[PDB]
């Protein structure tokens, strides 16, 4: 850790210096009211980008939060296979992956994995 | 010297007068939005004068069909300005800012040349 943090800072300093060189090495010209205008294919923009952007994969978005938190429970598997009771480890692991598949196929069949339409 | 014709939008001058006023409403409502959404020098009071100035151009118009067409074209611009299809340049085109005044007095025109 403490080694990694030091190099993490050292890299961040180095990368930071890079633009601090770029900001000075960059040619400097007077900024225009149009030069800094946004790019939207050369025609002025109708709509701010900060309007509410509708969402259609919201349902998947929530399911993503869940499925990760079961990744927290499969990852330890390997580490404790040499040390655990094989029946308990075998049984539980399987009924862990079957539960996941059944959940997935259930929603897939119910059509929730499809986007809002 | 009269002829039978097909009406454009209205049947009576009073209806035409009624339509024209609505076009004034919609423009007069819209000026505050145009100032915000266009990077142009003009302010609401200046623009609200330009609306008055030009509705006055067509002061002597009499034919209802001509008044209909002015209101058809007049409405078309407003939709193109209620939308921002018209760009910053086009809106300021209503002022002819680039063109500088040409003097009208005879002596000035003569000295300046044709
Ligand atoms: C100002 C605050 C300064 C304090 C530093 C803040 C920046 C943090 C950058 C260091 C992150 C990396 C780290 O510290 O990992 C620590 C830990 C390592 O643990 P280990 O598996 O034993 O490996 C050690 C190998 N020598 O592994 C971990 O704990 C997980 C680390 C995940 C790192 C994600 C990357 C973050 C990048 C910086 C974002 C800002
Ligand atoms: C041997 C297993 C037999 C399974 C039979 C599945 C046949 C057809 C599968 C399929 O995809 O057909 C379309 C059906 C419609 O489902 P839908 O709500 O439209 O969602 C998108 C589906 N691609 O899609 C579905 O409803 C289910 C799709 C997933 C089924 C996986 C079952 C695997 C069981 C092992």
Structural features, described:
- The structure is cut from a larger assembly and holds chains A (117 residues) and B (114 residues).
- By secondary structure, chain A is mostly helical.
- Chain A has one domain: Methane Monooxygenase Hydroxylase, Chain G, domain 1.
- Chain A is built from three helices and no strands.
- Chain A is flat and about 75 Å long.
- Chain A starts with a helix and ends in a 7-residue tail after the last helix.
- Chain B is mostly helical and 114 residues long.
- Helices cover 61% and strands 0% of the residues of chain B.
- The interface between A and B is small, with 4 and 6 residues.
- Bound molecules: 1,2-Distearoyl-sn-glycerophosphoethanolamine (2 copies).
- One 1,2-Distearoyl-sn-glycerophosphoethanolamine (3PE) binds at residues 1, 3-5, 8 of chain A.
- One 1,2-Distearoyl-sn-glycerophosphoethanolamine (3PE) binds next to helix 1 of chain A.
Give the CA-CA distance, first to last residue of chain A: 48 Å
* Net shape of chain B: flat
Number of domains of chain A: 1
Here the CATH topology of chain A equals: Methane Monooxygenase Hydroxylase, Chain G, domain 1
GO molecular function (chain B): oxidoreductase activity
Membrane topology (chain B): Peripheral membrane protein
GO cellular component, one term (chain B): mitochondrion
Family (chain B): Belongs to the complex I LYR family.
């Amino acid at each position: 850790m403490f080694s990694i943090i030091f190099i993490a800072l050292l890299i961040l300093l180095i990368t930071t210096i890079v633009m601090f060189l770029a900001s000075i090495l960059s040619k400097k010209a007077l900024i225009d009211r149009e030069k800094s205008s946004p790019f939207e294919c050369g025609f002025d923009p109708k709509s701010s980008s900060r309007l509410p952007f509708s969402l259609r994969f919201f349902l998947i978005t929530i399911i993503f939060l869940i499925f990760d938190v079961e990744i927290a429970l499969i990852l330890p598997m390997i580490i404790i296979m040499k040390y655990s009771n094989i029946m308990i480890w075998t049984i539980t692991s399987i009924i862990f992956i079957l539960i996941l598949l059944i959940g997935l196929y259930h929603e897939w069949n119910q059509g929730m994995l499809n986007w809002s339409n | 010297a009269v002829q039978q014709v097909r009406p454009i939008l209205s049947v009576d001058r009073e209806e035409a007068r009624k339509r024209a006023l609505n076009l004034y409403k919609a423009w007069y409502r819209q000026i505050p939005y145009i100032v915000m959404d266009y990077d142009i020098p003009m302010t609401v009071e200046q623009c609200r004068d330009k609306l008055r100035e030009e509705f006055v151009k067509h002061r002597n118009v009499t034919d209802i069909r001509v008044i209909d067409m002015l209101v058809i074209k007049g409405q078309m611009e407003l939709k193109e300005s209620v939308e921002i299809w018209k760009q910053k340049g086009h809106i300021m085109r209503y002022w002819k800012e680039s063109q500088d005044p040409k003097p009208t007095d005879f002596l000035s025109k003569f000295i300046q040349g044709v």
